Design a protein around this nucleic acid. Structure first.
Length: 85
DNA sequence: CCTGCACAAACACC
DNA sequence: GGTGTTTGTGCAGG
């Protein structure tokens, strides 16, 4: 059995996992797809100083993830792309 | 140096 | 279970 490692989540999911639950408790009738749209709208309204703390914590998650797999590399699946010249 | 694609998680509805 | 939705981060190509 092989255990695959998942990439660290950025400052938006960290913020959205906590903010998503609150929006579901206060808006139990709102669907996640509509909440996602409202969260993106509210997140773009946050100031750099307000987002800084969320940037610092996500970076800690990235370092803690790095401490678990310091030699990890992000390797995305690119689409068969061959451009003629 | 600049631009574009891939990939992460959570919940309601059928 | 699969679908539909969001932003941030990293790597590849020209």
């Amino acid at each position: 059995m092989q255990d695959r490692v998942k990439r660290p989540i950025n400052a938006f999911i960290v913020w959205s996992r906590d903010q998503r639950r609150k929006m579901a408790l206060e808006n139990p009738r709102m669907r996640n797809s509509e909440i996602s749209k409202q969260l993106g709208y509210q997140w773009k309204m946050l100031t750099e100083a307000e987002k800084w703390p969320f940037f610092q914590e996500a970076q800690k998650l990235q370092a803690m993830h790095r401490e678990k797999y310091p030699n990890y590399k992000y390797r995305p699946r690119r689409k068969a792309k061959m451009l003629p010249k």
